[PDB]
């Protein structure tokens, strides 16, 4: 509509939740599988959300109009940050823990026991608590994720500048949305964009881990997550 309608971005978010129902498969009744390791329950959810991320992306204005190979490049480059941002925001509802898309609730101490604390603590403090304190809504989460998606620095793009232009269209829609919805706080726009640095370093640190939970194997992971892990 207006290059980057904030409404469609919100619709992309809502379209691929959770949001009732999806929060019972393995949290209060049953639960296929039976893995004994928080890192496993997390890798499964991630693998599952990878499929939904593809659908989410197609709903972001102009993503699908990009050349198919560019679409592939963008999603391979941003999937970890895109997924971390989702579960982190979703986790605003819980205290000291994370809510997986599989409806599974991973507590702090389990992560600490599994040996992935610290990284888990960074997610909680640098992302979840930050998202909670400023109470970023789903429209905002959506735009930030769209900004992450449209990364012009992804190696291989057929037209980096086009991607940068799309990312810039999101900056404009978000800023406009913020001034109209949050005129009481002139610096919300900046506060939002400043949630990206932490997302990047945590995303990088998370990738470093995955590349360690692979080069040792022992009861492998799921296809796709594994496909995404074949390095950019």
């Amino acid at each position: 509509n207006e290059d980057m309608p904030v409404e469609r971005i919100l619709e992309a978010e809502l379209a691929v939740e959770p949001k009732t129902e999806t929060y019972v498969e393995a949290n209060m009744g049953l639960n296929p599988s039976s893995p004994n390791d928080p890192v496993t329950n997390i890798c499964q959810a991630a693998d599952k959300q990878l499929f939904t991320l593809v659908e989410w992306a197609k709903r972001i204005p102009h993503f699908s109009e990009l050349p198919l190979d560019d679409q592939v490049i963008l999603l391979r480059a941003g999937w970890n940050e895109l997924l971390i941002a989702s579960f982190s925001h979703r986790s605003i509802a819980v205290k000291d823990g994370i809510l997986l898309a599989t409806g599974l609730h991973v507590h702090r101490n389990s992560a600490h026991s599994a040996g992935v604390g610290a990284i888990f603590d960074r997610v909680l403090t640098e992302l979840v608590s930050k998202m909670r304190d400023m109470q970023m809504d789903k429209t905002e989460l959506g735009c930030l994720r769209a900004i992450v998606l449209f990364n012009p620095d992804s190696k291989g793009l057929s037209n980096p500048a086009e991607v940068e232009a799309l990312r810039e269209k999101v900056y404009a829609s978000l800023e406009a949305y913020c001034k109209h919805k949050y005129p009481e706080q002139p610096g919300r726009f900046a506060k939002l964009l400043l949630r990206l640095p932490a997302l990047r370093s945590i995303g990088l640190k998370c990738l470093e881990h995955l590349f360690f939970f692979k080069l040792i194997g022992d009861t492998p992971i799921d296809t796709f997550l594994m496909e995404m892990l074949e390095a950019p």
Binding site: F51, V54, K58, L68, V72, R76, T223, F224, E227, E230
Partner: peptide, 10 residues
């Protein structure tokens, strides 16, 4: 990227 490429083209 079988899965990703396949999921994207439908």
């Amino acid at each position: 990227h079988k899965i990703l490429h396949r999921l994207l083209q439908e």
